[PDB]
Amino acid sequence: VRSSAGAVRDAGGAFGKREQAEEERYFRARAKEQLAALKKHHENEIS
Amino acid sequence: YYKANVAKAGLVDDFEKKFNALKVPIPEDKYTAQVDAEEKEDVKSCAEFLTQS
Amino acid sequence: DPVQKLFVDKIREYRTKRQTSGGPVDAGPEYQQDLDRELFKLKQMYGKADMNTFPNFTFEDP
Amino acid sequence: VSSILEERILGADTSVDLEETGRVLSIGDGIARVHGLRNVQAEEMVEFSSGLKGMSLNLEPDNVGVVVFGNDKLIKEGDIVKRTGAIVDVPVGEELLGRVVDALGNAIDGKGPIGSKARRRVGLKAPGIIPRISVREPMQTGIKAVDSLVPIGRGQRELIIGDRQTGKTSIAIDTIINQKRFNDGTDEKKKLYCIYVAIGQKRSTVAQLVKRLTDADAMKYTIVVSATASDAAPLQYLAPYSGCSMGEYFRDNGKHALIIYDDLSKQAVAYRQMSLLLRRPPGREAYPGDVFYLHSRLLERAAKMNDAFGGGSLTALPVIETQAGDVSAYIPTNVISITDGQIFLETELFYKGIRPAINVGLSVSRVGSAAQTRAMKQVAGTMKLELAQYREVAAFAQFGSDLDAATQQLLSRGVRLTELLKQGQYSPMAIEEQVAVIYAGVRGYLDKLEPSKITKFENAFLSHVISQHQALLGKIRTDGKISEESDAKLKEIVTNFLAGF
Numbered sequence: 001v002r003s004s005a006g007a008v009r010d011a012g013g014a015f016g017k018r019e020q021a022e023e024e025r026y027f028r029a030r031a032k033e034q035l036a037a038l039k040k041h042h043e044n045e046i047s
Numbered sequence: 048y049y050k051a052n053v054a055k056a057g058l059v060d061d062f063e064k065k066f067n068a069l070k071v072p073i074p075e076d077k078y079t080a081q082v083d084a085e086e087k088e089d090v091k092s093c094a095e096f097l098t099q100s
Numbered sequence: 101d102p103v104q105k106l107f108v109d110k111i112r113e114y115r116t117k118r119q120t121s122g123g124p125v126d127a128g129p130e131y132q133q134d135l136d137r138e139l140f141k142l143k144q145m146y147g148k149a150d151m152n153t154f155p156n157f158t159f160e161d162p
Numbered sequence: 163v164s165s166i167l168e169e170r171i172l173g174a175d176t177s178v179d180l181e182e183t184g185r186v187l188s189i190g191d192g193i194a195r196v197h198g199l200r201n202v203q204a205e206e207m208v209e210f211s212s213g214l215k216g217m218s219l220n221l222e223p224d225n226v227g228v229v230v231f232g233n234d235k236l237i238k239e240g241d242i243v244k245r246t247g248a249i250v251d252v253p254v255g256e257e258l259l260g261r262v263v264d265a266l267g268n269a270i271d272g273k274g275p276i277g278s279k280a281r282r283r284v285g286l287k288a289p290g291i292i293p294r295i296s297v298r299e300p301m302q303t304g305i306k307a308v309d310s311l312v313p314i315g316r317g318q319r320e321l322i323i324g325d326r327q328t329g330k331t332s333i334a335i336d337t338i339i340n341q342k343r344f345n346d347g348t349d350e351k352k353k354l355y356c357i358y359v360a361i362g363q364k365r366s367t368v369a370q371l372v373k374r375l376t377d378a379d380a381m382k383y384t385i386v387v388s389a390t391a392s393d394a395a396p397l398q399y400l401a402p403y404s405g406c407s408m409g410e411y412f413r414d415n416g417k418h419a420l421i422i423y424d425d426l427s428k429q430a431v432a433y434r435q436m437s438l439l440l441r442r443p444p445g446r447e448a449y450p451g452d453v454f455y456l457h458s459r460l461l462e463r464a465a466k467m468n469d470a471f472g473g474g475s476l477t478a479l480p481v482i483e484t485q486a487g488d489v490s491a492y493i494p495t496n497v498i499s500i501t502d503g504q505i506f507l508e509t510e511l512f513y514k515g516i517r518p519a520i521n522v523g524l525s526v527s528r529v530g531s532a533a534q535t536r537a538m539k540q541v542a543g544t545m546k547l548e549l550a551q552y553r554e555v556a557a558f559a560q561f562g563s564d565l566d567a568a569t570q571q572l573l574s575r576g577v578r579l580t581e582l583l584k585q586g587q588y589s590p591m592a593i594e595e596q597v598a599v600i601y602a603g604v605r606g607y608l609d610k611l612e613p614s615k616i617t618k619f620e621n622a623f624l625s626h627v628i629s630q631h632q633a634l635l636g637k638i639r640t641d642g643k644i645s646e647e648s649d650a651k652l653k654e655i656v657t658n659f660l661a662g663f
């Protein structure tokens with residue numbers, strides 16, 4: 001009897017979905033700031 | 048052995064002889080030219096640097 | 101050894117065959133078709149170079 | 163041709179004989195129920211009229227249940243079954259080396275016929291308790307992890323267990339290829355005559371395999387039995403014993419052999435089909451009650467004869483496949499309690515980049531220190547202790563920092579050793595090169611070198627040692643120990659090289 005790696009997501013329990021939740025915060029916020037920065041960049045390049 | 052198994056009339060020894068006649072092109076020294084480098088480097092170190100040092 | 105008529109039967113069918121070997125008797129055009137297909141496939145496995153000479157190279161130096 | 167056909171006809175056996183006989187009552191699913199054959203020995207080879215074979219496996223009081231060695235499309239209720247009186251036997255000798263034979267020792271390679279002289283049964287008994295002598299010599303597999311942490315002596319059963327596509331056959335074939343250096347050399351006390359039994363594989367896989375072996379010119383000393391997926395159940399149930407008898411010939415002829423069963427979980431399935439069709443009572447997972455006797459009487463032929471019976475040997479590396487690390491299933495536990503070890507392979511390790519994906523935590527060998535050379539023993543004792551220490555606290559790895567410098571050292575050593583154990587495919591290494599690399603690894607001559615580069619170092623080091631200091635390696639190899647002079651010389655080479663890179 002043993003365990004595996006990357007198994008807190010397969011169970012789909014409470015943690016399996018809270019983990020999706022946490023990751024999705026982090027990367028939604030990062031995507032927002034990255035989109036703003038890319039905008040800023042192209043708008044600056046108009047000059 | 049080839050002639051033995053190879054019932055072909057003469058192609059066996061035909062190619063045998065032709066092969067034995069054919070000779071490979073040995074490559075020729077063409078990079079082999081920068082030797083003065085050594086000597087002129089020798090100058091930089093042994094003449095242009097020896098006396099100044 | 102000739103006591104078994106089977107041996108002589110096979111033997112003289114064989115003989116008549118060898119005498120007929122002036123050509124491959126009763127080859128049948130399907131024989132030729134099989135030859136065709138497999139001979140091509142063999143050649144492609146062996147390449148397309150003319151199978152008669154010493155294909156020259158004229159090797160390239162650095 | 164024609165002229166050859168003449169003696170092809172002549173070279174026959176036309177004679178007839180007064181033979182016993184029984185007539186088929188029934189047929190279907192590959193199981194004839196012959197009626198008659200009153201004097202047929204259990205487990206005997208009968209021949210049907212059409213031309214097939216059969217192994218009269220189930221002597222019931224009124225009929226004999228025979229198992230056909232092929233499609234029974236050729237058999238009909240009413241056919242004649244004539245007994246031969248001879249238990250199943252197979253050809254043996256050194257004529258087989260380099261050939262490919264099927265379960266019954268019939269060349270399926272084209273390439274002419276087998277010119278064997280002496281045959282041999284397939285249901286012999288294993289050597290007793292007195293003939294054997296303790297396992298002492300090593301079988302260099304050429305794989306760092308196998309050859310240092312989980313050694314394999316000659317005369318030892320070493321299960322190679324693991325899930326699907328983790329590299330079990332690759333380990334076996336690296337082992338087969340490694341023996342080339344011995345089998346080309348001189349001494350006859352280090353030549354291993356590998357055998358490879360392919361069960362349940364498709365003929366394409368065995369063809370690719372023999373291609374690999376031929377490329378490395380490793381066929382001149384290998385036999386390759388093959389009961390592939392299309393061959394009726396009896397020929398898969400019976401191939402391992404054909405291989406084991408071909409190997410027993412060497413073993414009792416004072417030679418050293420090595421037999422690789424691949425898989426042994428596709429032989430038990432074939433035996434289950436045979437039994438369930440013969441209507442024998444089923445058991446757990448539907449396997450009969452003999453699926454332990456089956457394997458046990460096979461893997462107990464791998465012995466190491468003493469010096470009064472010749473001094474021969476027969477290793478055995480049964481490859482087993484476990485369904486998602488379910489080592490508790492029936493067959494995995496049946497074959498784990500027969501053998502002297504296990505080389506566990508895992509996919510978490512295979513995809514982390516640790517290839518070969520050996521899981522040193524679960525892999526053990528119950529000979530242990532013995533079955534190693536004194537040099538490899540000296541290196542591997544410290545390596546094993548260091549790796550165990552690293553494993554017991556690897557859980558912290560993802561943090562690393564924020565922790566004591568002692569555990570930081572432990573992680574910085576374990577990572578280096580793990581990276582050193584990584585190996586390529588079909589690139590086995592002589593024992594001296596393994597000792598050199600793992601010496602440069604366990605003595606701290608890499609702790610200051612970033613892990614990502616270790617592999618580079620390894621290769622470079624070998625190129626810088628093989629081409630430069632073959633004398634030192636020969637000194638280590640001929641006497642398999644590190645004399646203080648050799649130790650210091652290794653230290654100097656490691657230090658100066660690392661400085662020069």
Ligand SMILES: Nc1ncnc2c1ncn2[C@@H]1O[C@H](COP(=O)(O)OP(=O)(O)OP(=O)(O)O)[C@@H](O)[C@H]1O
Nearest residue numbers: 325326327328329330331332333517518585586587
């Ligand atoms: N040392 C290695 N380095 C890199 N890749 C490897 C190594 N060993 C095995 N592999 C890869 O693992 C794959 C499977 O190998 P292999 O057939 O040996 O495993 P297997 O368990 O026998 O497969 P199966 O169980 O399906 O027969 C191969 O495609 C090979 O590329």
Ligand SMILES: [Mg+2]
Nearest residue numbers: 330331332424
């Ligand atoms: Mg395999």
